[PDB]
């Protein structure tokens, strides 16, 4: 049941290949973007069930990426790979409905782990 669209924003390629096929086997649609602002463009026409954002490119490292998401999507939850920058912006995330902040590690094991158990807690 349910579609299941998981969007990721990071270095792509490596992160994409793993999360794309592997997460696809789980029954979801995993796509990746450059870092964050890219998903925003796509977000302007769609909303993923579990968004994943990077944090090492934009102004506020990555938390800034959250701000963009909350500006147009004050509900779409996002998952950041790092929280070493201005954590302040991460707060605007929790208020808009962000997912959380995961350490640099991720891959399928660490990401799929946080995604499945997370969506399961939400349910329809
Ligand atoms: F690689 Be991301 F900037 F955490």
Swiss-Prot record:
<feature type="domain" description="Response regulatory">
    <location>
        <begin position="5"/>
        <end position="119"/>
    </location>
</feature>
<comment type="function">
    <text>Member of the two-component regulatory system NtrB/NtrC, which controls expression of the nitrogen-regulated (ntr) genes in response to nitrogen limitation. Phosphorylated NtrC binds directly to DNA and stimulates the formation of open promoter-sigma54-RNA polymerase complexes.</text>
</comment>
<feature type="modified residue" description="4-aspartylphosphate">
    <location>
        <position position="54"/>
    </location>
</feature>
<protein>
    <recommendedName>
        <fullName>DNA-binding transcriptional regulator NtrC</fullName>
    </recommendedName>
</protein>
